[PDB]
UniProtKB/Swiss-Prot annotation, chain A:
ATP-binding component of the Arp2/3 complex, a multiprotein complex that mediates actin polymerization upon stimulation by nucleation-promoting factor (NPF). The Arp2/3 complex mediates the formation of branched actin networks in the cytoplasm, providing the force for cell motility. Seems to contact the pointed end of the daughter actin filament. In podocytes, required for the formation of lamellipodia downstream of AVIL and PLCE1 regulation. This is Actin-related protein 2. It comes from Bos taurus. GO terms for molecular function: actin binding; ATP binding. The chain holds residues 80 to 379 of 394 of the full protein. It comes from the Eukaryota. Belongs to the actin family. ARP2 subfamily. GO terms for cellular component: Arp2/3 protein complex; cell cortex; cell projection; cytoplasm; cytosol; nucleus; site of double-strand break. GO terms for biological process: Arp2/3 complex-mediated actin nucleation; positive regulation of double-strand break repair via homologous recombination; positive regulation of lamellipodium assembly; positive regulation of transcription by RNA polymerase II. It is found in: Cytoplasm, Cytoskeleton; Cell projection; Nucleus. ATP binds at G22, D23, G24, R76, M77, I78, K79, E80. Component of the Arp2/3 complex composed of ACTR2/ARP2, ACTR3/ARP3, ARPC1B/p41-ARC, ARPC2/p34-ARC, ARPC3/p21-ARC, ARPC4/p20-ARC and ARPC5/p16-ARC. Interacts with AVIL.
From Swiss-Prot, chain C:
The lineage of its organism: Eukaryota, Metazoa, Chordata, Craniata, Vertebrata. GO terms for cellular component: Arp2/3 protein complex; cell projection; cytoplasm; cytosol; nucleus; site of double-strand break. The keyword Transferase does not apply. Its main location: cytoplasm. One of its GO terms (molecular function) is actin binding. This is Actin-related protein 3. Disulfide bonds: none annotated. Keywords: Acetylation, Actin-binding, ATP-binding, Cell projection, Cilium biogenesis/degradation, Cytoplasm, Cytoskeleton, Nucleotide-binding, Nucleus. It holds the Pfam family Actin. The keyword Ribonucleoprotein does not apply.
Curated annotation (Swiss-Prot), chain E:
GO terms for cellular component: Arp2/3 protein complex; cytosol; nucleus. Component of the Arp2/3 complex, a multiprotein complex that mediates actin polymerization upon stimulation by nucleation-promoting factor (NPF). The Arp2/3 complex mediates the formation of branched actin networks in the cytoplasm, providing the force for cell motility. In addition to its role in the cytoplasmic cytoskeleton, the Arp2/3 complex also promotes actin polymerization in the nucleus, thereby regulating gene transcription and repair of damaged DNA. One of its GO terms (molecular function) is actin filament binding. GO terms for biological process: Arp2/3 complex-mediated actin nucleation. PROSITE patterns: WD_REPEATS_2, WD_REPEATS_REGION. Keywords: Actin-binding, Cytoplasm, Cytoskeleton, Nucleus, Repeat, WD repeat. The gene is ARPC1B. The lineage of its organism: Eukaryota, Metazoa, Chordata, Craniata, Vertebrata. The keyword Nucleus applies. WD repeats lie at residues 5-44, 49-88, 93-134, 139-178, 241-279, 306-349. This is Actin-related protein 2/3 complex subunit 1B. Belongs to the WD repeat ARPC1 family.
UniProtKB/Swiss-Prot annotation, chain G:
This is Actin-related protein 2/3 complex subunit 3. GO terms for molecular function: actin binding. It comes from Bos taurus (Bovine). The gene is ARPC3. GO terms for biological process: Arp2/3 complex-mediated actin nucleation; regulation of actin filament polymerization. It is found in: Cytoplasm, Cytoskeleton; Cell projection; Nucleus. Belongs to the ARPC3 family.
Length: 228, 284, 392, 167, 354, 139, 174
């Protein structure tokens, strides 16, 4: 079913730790600078399908009459529309009810239109709030923390709504259940987001003679690449 | 509508579509409707065993044991007469109109059956009317529980019949609205010096009933009522009754109807406002 | 309390009201009303506001679903007081809501009363779902429902007991658009129909007589042989003259209601038999819901009441769908579908009928909103009104 | 009027000190965009809270820093019925607040009604007749509320008379 | 004169030393280029490579390169390719958001302000191919406003949330050497406090340097103006205005000054150094037959300002900072300035300049 | 509910808060020099040292709230003349102080205080009221 | 949809742009003796009821095309037949209202040019004109009685009305 393709590549139509997930389960990022280490494989059973889903259920409680499956994709596009992440939930949550300057309109496909409340910083929060989907997972923070403290104890220093939020998680757990002190200022930590892709090191000259050619890829018996 | 309906229309169009079958040559089919009314009462027409050629409408009243002897269980029939029959388990008064036994052209019945409450209450009134319109002092006042908690009391003084007010409203402020009405209700008799009066008293009942039992409280309110001789006499022992008890539902309604109009204003001073809002951008 | 609740199903033209656990919805009356042109007290509605010549009649439920809320509140006032008669702080209620009812629109309903009479609590029910009233008397909350009233048709189906803001389309077919045809074809026939009481006759002709015919060019000979076995004369009454005139009501009886399967038949205004439209709808829905959307065919509403109507639709919808499924075993094979109509009983003015027995129940009292709960967060907490009827 | 204007007179300009603004990208956090004045996540972003009351019964708070501007006011709760009326008025206003990207669903602290002027408002909208909303509202609201006493008192009367001539 | 564009307000923008093209952003995430032709402008090669809003825009004069940049980082020039500008990927090392950009007279390095407690001063690396960027670091910890360049292509300054402005010496060894000195700071160690501020209450929306290095002006938000003379013993003057707070300013002469803003209209400023204290006296506006016609009252959308909305930017044209003659402002709504600086000198009552 | 209770966002070395810097008319210094026939100048005295060199409400509640008086026990037909007798660095200062009384109506502890403000314009400029907004070391 | 023809056999030589089926008539019939109880003429009678009302016919067979001419011909039986005193009066019209050489496919006066095309020759054509004629006469007398009634001066107070609606809206008369 797959091999029917993987041809549209030539003639047919041609000539440390970070993070990355979408809808087909989450995944954490164990990689000792360079190669990944299965030594730390953890995953959350909540993803995009679950974010669209808690969002669907939330939208229904807002006043909009919607049935899934058929419209999963509409609401899905809605997900990556303006579903930003809140930074401090007590404040952000009280800023959605006390005020109404969070409200945005989206021209659906049925020419009906429907205003949207503050679920944008409520719905995607499926991480920090695993309970929203019954799941017992632990949330980006408990997850991040537990992951570094595991073996590699030595040299640890080394959806537009989360890059800034990630910085808060530097403390959430570091100060309350670990260094309960207050001179933590040190131990500096920074989060970026280049949001490019994986399409890198795929034309590297460091791969132009390090990636087995075809005079030695099978010469010594179809098995010259079963390592790495 | 200003006063209030007491003829019980929820009985006239329904009953007619049973009577009209013998006005051109049509069979009389059965029917089943079990509605209700105010003060708690709620009629309900039903067939006997399954007789489609026989209709019968009754009534369920909670406070019946109490207002039973009060002549209620004496006269009543005096109005319906032989149309009035043996009661029903679970209910009370029973009226029976036969699509077969039809006394022709006498609509003077519907209006007599519709307001079944009036006829029943009438007794408790006629009884006290004699102790004032006929004489005899040193008597005793009636007991009314149209609700578990609101109550109306009567007075069989010398020559005058007044009703006691107690009723209670929920919403703290809805209580407050009544104050506008009670004001413009007793201190503004422009109808005629013959118009009965209506004292007032909140959080406390007039002395004319301070030493007895009565629900009492800060959100609770009592009222008074009068009934000059010209109002309690026989020659008027109907016009006064025609629209008396209506007070209960008369107050709630009106007291509530204003709260609809007030909403409307909160729309003009807004329909106009939103336009003002749109009148701010480079272009509407 | 031991007291039954009040239920109201309005609609574009006629308005339906009543109590709880009754065979018919007590009364059904036109919604128009008016004041001159302190002032809110003087106003009439129903079989009264249609005669008033000093008041001007306006209709609040236009463009289908609910409209002008201010004007609506006055109506609700008379509905309660001088009609059903109930002290509202003592009775649970029910106000239908055409599908598509946005949160904004729902908020308008939740308010007013709650902020006026502070009635205990109220459910806002969906038309199509209620439109599964007595159809259970002839079990399921999945099926395809046609509610088509007077202003246009409606392909409101099911979906686990909710609205499907997508799978529905309307067809400009309406009881009246049938009437234009019957009366139109009649004009060219026997003369003697006053232009003024012309409409009168159309509304009346549609009701008192009309029916559906299995085949077109079928009876159309039996109806010319036994002309004296069906052809009757309408006993209409004049207006200004008040003179009685009888005409021979004939083909239009079955040659008119036929505008349902061929809406394009009277006037071209449409391009598709209704049964076919239903097919577009069902096959366009998600498969895991297209099957059930075939064994449940319900009508209900002021335009679905016609002799031999229910029969002719199952067949018509079935033959085309069977034909489509033929063009698929050419790859051999699949499971032949299976449609089916449903003509329960209270098809005339259902919905009210449904909801009411099922609201005369404690369950209604569970999902219903409480007064104290309303004064808490406000009226918003009524935008969503959870379904209840199967396992519950 | 003696003085139901000079109050409105100082106010009729006091606001023209915060209006002008622009869409403001988030410092402390990022790409969120909100009302600092409503969050104060940037302590430096504050114009000192200020209040221009006329006496004590009709107060009016005023705040702001940038894409966020606060403006609270205490309705003239003159009598028993106005006390009850105002929350029940503010509420209608508060419920459809989503349609008036300017009014807060709930008033700020203790006050009866609160506004909010953001950068979005001063862009697709001017500032002159937009500011004038306030005169056209405090004064207009007073007439509607003050007239209520007459609407209820005068309206109540008809119910009593139309109930006496029939006895 | 007067001329608008669209309802929405344009954030930033830069002009080209050719008075023909011009890149602008309408509260969107993509710049826009136009072309002249008998007073008829038309959309030209729409430049779109910005996710969210877009602030930073500057146009390097005799080199013809455009540098865009918005909140969500952003950083990719569009230089003429064939005839269809192109975008470039360039991340300025943040974690917050960028606000304003100015190239430099030397046109080899652009500067993009910011509020994430940094300014960022990237630069092209020919010896390394790909682009790069520097860092002025402290002392800064607030929203960073725009930043103009000094008639030197080296030393610069700009205001921020710190209330008081600040001047740094942008020096690049891997490109340039010891730029010659100025009375501001003989030392040029790439980023050194050269001069501070006296307003310790007042913010800073805009700054502009005099075409010569002795006159520095900067406005806050509290309707104040500031002026410091480096040649006048680095004296710091001050004088507040009666009207609202302006937003934009430029040196129309080597000692002149002008700008408007949220008031929606231009005012004129000069300066007598020999007094050490601020001087005001502008307020320009208009509330062989041609050399006379196009006036008239009327014979007795409705503002007494030229503009119908607060201004933001205000880049000159012919003689930008040495001897102006034609400058432009772009306000939020239509309100975009269109006027010959002299078609003003030849008018109003008392006019200074210089 | 557990670790989300703590708030470190207020300890970020990069978070920023003003430099807390930290006297006033003498309750009688100019008072006397007022009681006579001087309702046009002397009242200007209320300027010697502005509450900006020290914190605490104490000083601001007295040495700073002292200027509330003077203007209170005034009339009206003589207000403007005092105002023009000021400059850019002496007019706005009276506006910020104006706002203190406006913050504490206290019924009597205020009364009006709108005249001096109305007339405060014309000379101080629409900015006067706005300038107050951008002030760290307010009254 | 509507109703088309049922009889289409290969014997019917495709004449021009139609069929050529025969019918049961007593006058000039250039087609054989139909041995059925329902000929072309009968087919039209048993139909046309929903013809005018229908607006979307599908040309299935060339018999449908003949049926179509005849259905359209029925219309003349009203411009000059609907207003005729007694049936024994509208009979003579059949001759003139039928013999009147009608615009055969191909003519400067004939509508329905779609599937219709005269044979672009003079043999099939002139000869085709002879079939196109018996209908103008047999379809009329064989139609007046069924449409009318044993009564006199009563062109069926129900049929003599369908004068205002025409099939597909195509005036075969003007």
């Amino acid at each position: 079913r797959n091999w029917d393709d993987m041809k549209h590549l030539w003639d047919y139509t041609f000539g440390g730790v970070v993070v990355d997930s979408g809808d087909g389960v989450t995944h954490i990022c164990p990689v000792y600078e360079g190669f990944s280490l299965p030594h730390l494989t953890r995953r959350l059973d909540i993803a995009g399908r679950d974010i669209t889903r808690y969002l669907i259920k939330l939208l229904l409680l807002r006043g909009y009459a919607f049935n899934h499956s058929a419209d999963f994709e509409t609401v899905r596009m809605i997900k990556e529309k303006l579903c930003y992440v809140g930074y401090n939930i007590e404040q952000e949550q009280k800023l959605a009810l006390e005020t109404t300057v969070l409200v945005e309109s989206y021209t659906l496909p049925d020419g009906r239109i429907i205003k949207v409340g503050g679920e944008r910083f409520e719905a995607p929060e499926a991480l920090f709030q695993p309970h929203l989907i019954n799941v017992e997972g632990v949330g980006v923070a408990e997850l991040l923390f537990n992951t570094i403290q595991a073996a590699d104890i030595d040299t640890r220093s080394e959806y537009p709504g989360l890059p800034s939020r990630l910085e808060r998680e530097l403390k959430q757990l570091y100060l309350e259940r670990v260094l309960k002190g207050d001179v933590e200022k040190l131990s500096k930590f920074k989060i970026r987001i280049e949001d490019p892709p994986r399409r890198k090191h795929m034309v590297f000259l460091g791969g132009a003679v390090l990636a087995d050619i075809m005079k030695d890829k099978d010469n010594f018996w179809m098995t010259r690449q079963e390592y790495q | 509508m200003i006063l209030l309906e007491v003829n019980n229309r929820i009985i006239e169009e329904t009953l007619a579509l049973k009577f009209e079958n013998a006005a051109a040559g049509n069979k009389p089919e059965a029917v089943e409707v079990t509605f209700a009314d105010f003060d708690g009462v709620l009629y309900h027409i039903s067939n006997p065993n399954g007789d489609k050629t026989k209709v019968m409408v009754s009534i369920s009243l909670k406070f019946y044991k109490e207002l039973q002897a009060h002549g209620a269980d004496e006269l009543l029939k005096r109005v319906y007469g032989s149309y009035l029959v043996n009661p029903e388990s679970g209910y009370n008064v029973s009226l029976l109109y036969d699509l077969e036994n039809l006394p022709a052209s006498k609509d003077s019945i519907v209006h007599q059956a519709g307001m079944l409450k009036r006829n029943c209450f009438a007794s408790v009134f006629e009884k006290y009317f004699q102790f004032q319109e006929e004489g005899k002092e040193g008597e005793n006042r009636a007991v009314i529980h149209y609700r578990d908690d609101e109550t109306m009391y009567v007075e069989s003084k010398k020559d005058r019949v007044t009703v006691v007010f107690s009723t209670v409203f929920k919403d703290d402020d809805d209580v407050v609205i009544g104050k506008v009405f009670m004001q413009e209700f007793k201190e503004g008799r422009r109808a005629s010096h013959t118009a009965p009066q209506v004292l007032f008293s909140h959080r406390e009942p007039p002395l004319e009933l301070k030493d007895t039992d009565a629900a009492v409280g800060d959100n609770i309110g009592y009222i008074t009522f009068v009934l000059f001789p010209r109002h309690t006499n026989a020659s008027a022992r109907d016009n006064t009754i025609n629209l008396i008890h209506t007070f209960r539902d008369y107050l709630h309604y009106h007291i509530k109807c204003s709260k609809a109009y007030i909403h409307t204003r909160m729309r003009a001073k807004t329909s106009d406002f939103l336009k003002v809002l749109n009148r701010a951008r480079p272009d509407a | 309390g031991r007291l039954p609740a009040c239920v109201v199903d309005c609609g574009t033209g006629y308005t339906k009201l009543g109590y709880a656990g009754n065979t018919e919805p007590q009364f059904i009356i036109p919604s128009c009303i008016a004041i001159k042109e302190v002032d809110d007290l003087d106003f009439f509605i129903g079989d009264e506001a249609i005669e008033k010549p000093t008041y001007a009649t306006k209709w609040p439920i236009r463009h289908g679903i609910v409209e002008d809320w201010d004007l609506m509140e006055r109506f609700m006032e008379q509905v309660i007081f001088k009609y059903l008669r109930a002290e509202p702080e003592d009775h649970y209620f029910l106000l239908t809501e055409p599908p598509l009812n946005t949160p904004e629109n729902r908020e308008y309903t939740a308010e007013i009363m709650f902020e006026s009479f502070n009635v205990p609590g109220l459910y806002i029910a969906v038309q199509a779902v209620l439109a599964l009233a007595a159809s259970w008397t002839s079990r399921t909350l999945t099926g395809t429902v046609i509610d088509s009233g007077d202003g246009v048709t409606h392909v409101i189906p099911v979906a686990e007991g909710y609205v499907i803001g997508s799978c529905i389309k309307h067809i400009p077919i309406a009881g009246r658009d049938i009437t234009y045809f019957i009366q139109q074809l009649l004009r060219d026939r026997e003369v003697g129909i006053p232009p003024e009481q012309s409409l009168e006759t159309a509304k009346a002709v549609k009701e008192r007589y009309s029916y559906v015919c299995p085949d077109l060019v079928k009876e159309f000979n039996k109806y010319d042989t036994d002309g004296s076995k069906w052809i009757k004369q309408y006993t209409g009454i004049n207006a200004i003259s008040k003179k009685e005139f009888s005409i021979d009501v004939g083909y239009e009886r079955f040659l008119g209601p036929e505008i349902f399967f061929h809406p394009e038949f009277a006037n071209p205004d449409f391009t598709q038999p209704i049964s076919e439209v239903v097919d577009e709808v069902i096959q366009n829905c998600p498969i895991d819901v297209r099957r059930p959307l075939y064994k449940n065919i319900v009508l209900s509403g002021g335009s679905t009441m016609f002799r031999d109507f229910g029969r002719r639709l199952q067949r018509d919808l079935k033959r085309t769908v069977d034909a489509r499924l033929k063009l698929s075993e050419e790859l051999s094979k699949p499971k032949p579908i299976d449609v089916q109509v449903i003509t329960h009983h209270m098809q005339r003015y259902a919905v009210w009928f449904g909801g009411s027995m099922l609201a005369s129940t404690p369950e209604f009292y569970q999902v219903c909103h409480t007064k104290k709960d309303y004064e808490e967060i406000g009226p918003s907490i009524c935008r969503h009104n959870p379904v209840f009827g199967v396992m519950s | 009027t003696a003085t139901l204007r000079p109050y409105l007179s100082a106010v009729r300009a006091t606001l023209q000190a915060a209006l002008c603004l622009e869409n403001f990208s988030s410092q402390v956090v990022e790409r969120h965009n909100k009302p600092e004045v409503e969050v104060r996540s940037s302590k430096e972003l504050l114009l000192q809270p200020v209040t221009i009351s006329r006496n004590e019964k009709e107060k009016v708070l005023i705040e702001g820093s940038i894409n966020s501007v606060r403006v609270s006011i205490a309705v003239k709760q003159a009598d028993e019925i106005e006390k009850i009326l105002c929350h029940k008025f503010m509420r209608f206003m508060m419920m459809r607040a989503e349609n008036f990207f300017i009014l807060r669903r709930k008033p700020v602290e203790g006050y009866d009604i609160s506004f909010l002027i953001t950068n979005f408002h001063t862009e697709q909208m001017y500032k002159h007749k937009l500011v004038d909303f306030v005169i056209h509202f405090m004064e207009e609201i007073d007439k509607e509320i003050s007239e209520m006493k007459l609407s209820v008192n005068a309206r109540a009367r008809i119910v009593a008379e139309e109930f006496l001539k029939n006895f | 004169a007067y001329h608008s564009f669209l309802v929405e307000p344009i954030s930033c923008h830069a002009w080209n030393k050719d008075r023909t093209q011009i890149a602008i952003c309408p509260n969107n995430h993509e710049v826009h280029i136009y072309e002249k032709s008998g007073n008829k402008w038309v959309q030209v090669h729409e430049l779109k490579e910005h996710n969210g809003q877009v602030t930073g825009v500057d146009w390097a004069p005799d080199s013809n390169r455009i540098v865009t940049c918005g909140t969500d980082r952003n950083a990719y020039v569009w230089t003429l390719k064939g005839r269809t500008w192109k975008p470039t990927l360039v991340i300025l090392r943040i974690n917050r958001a960028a606000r304003c950009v100015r190239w430099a007279p030397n046109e080899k390095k652009f500067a993009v302000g910011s509020g994430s407690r940094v300014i960022s001063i990237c630069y092209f690396e020919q010896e390394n191919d790909w682009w790069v960027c520097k860092h002025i670091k402290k002392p800064i910890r607030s929203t960073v406003l725009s930043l103009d360049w000094h008639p030197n292509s080296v030393l610069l300054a700009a205001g921020s949330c710190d209330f008081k402005c600040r001047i740094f010496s942008a020096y690049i060894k891997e490109v340039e050497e010891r730029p010659a000195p100025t009375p501001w700071g003989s030392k040029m160690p790439f980023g050194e406090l050269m001069f501070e501020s006296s307003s310790s209450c007042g913010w800073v929306h805009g700054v502009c340097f005099s075409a010569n290095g002795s006159r520095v002006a900067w406005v806050s938000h509290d309707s104040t103006v500031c002026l410091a003379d480096a040649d006048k013993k680095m004296a710091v003057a001050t004088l507040a205005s009666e009207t609202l707070p302006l937003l934009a300013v430029t040196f129309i002469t080597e000692s002149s000054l002008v700008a408007a803003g949220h008031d929606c209209f231009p005012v004129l400023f000069t300066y007598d150094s020999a007094a050490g204290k601020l001087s005001f006296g502008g307020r320009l506006d208009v509330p062989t037959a041609r050399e006379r016609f196009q006036n008239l009252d009327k014979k007795a959308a409705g503002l007494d300002s030229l503009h119908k909305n607060s201004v933001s930017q205000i880049s000159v044209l012919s003689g930008g900072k040495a001897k102006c003659s034609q400058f432009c402002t772009t306000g939020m709504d239509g309100g975009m300035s269109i006027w010959d600086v002299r078609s003003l000198e030849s008018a109003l009552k008392d006019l200074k300049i210089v | 509910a557990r670790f989300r209770k703590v708030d470190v966002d207020e300890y970020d070395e990069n978070k920023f808060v003003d430099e807390d810097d930290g006297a006033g008319p003498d309750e009688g210094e100019v008072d006397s020099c007022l009681r006579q026939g001087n309702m046009t100048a002397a009242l200007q005295a209320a300027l010697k040292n502005p509450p900006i060199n020290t914190k605490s409400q104490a000083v601001k509640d007295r040495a700073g709230s002292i200027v509330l008086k003077v203007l209170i026990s005034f009339k009206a037909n003589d207000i403007e003349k005092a105002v023009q007798s000021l400059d850019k660095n002496g007019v706005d200062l009276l506006m910020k102080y104006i706002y203190k009384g406006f913050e504490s109506p206290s019924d009597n502890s205020s009364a009006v205080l709108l005249q001096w403000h109305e007339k405060a314009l014309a000379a101080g400029g629409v900015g006067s009221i706005v300038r107050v907004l951008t002030a760290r070391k307010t009254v | 949809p509507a109703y088309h023809s049922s009889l289409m056999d290969p014997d019917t030589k495709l004449i021009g742009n139609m069929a050529l089926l025969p019918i049961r008539s007593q006058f000039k019939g250039p087609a054989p003796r139909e041995t059925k109880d329902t000929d072309i003429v009968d087919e039209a009678i048993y139909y046309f009821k929903a013809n005018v009302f229908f607006k979307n016919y599908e040309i299935k067979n060339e018999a449908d095309r003949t049926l179509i001419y005849i259905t359209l011909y029925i219309s003349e039986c009203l411009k000059k037949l609907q207003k005729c005193n007694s049936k024994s009066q509208g009979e003579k019209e059949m001759y003139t209202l039928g013999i009147t050489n009608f615009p055969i496919p191909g003519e400067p006066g004939f509508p329905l040019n779609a599937i219709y095309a005269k044979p672009a020759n003079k043999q099939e054509d002139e000869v085709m004109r002879a079939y196109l004629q018996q209908l103008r006469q047999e379809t009329g007398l064989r139609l007046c009685e069924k449409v009318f009634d044993p009564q006199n001066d009563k062109p069926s107070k129900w049929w003599t009305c369908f004068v205002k609606r025409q099939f597909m809206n195509k005036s075969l008369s003007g």
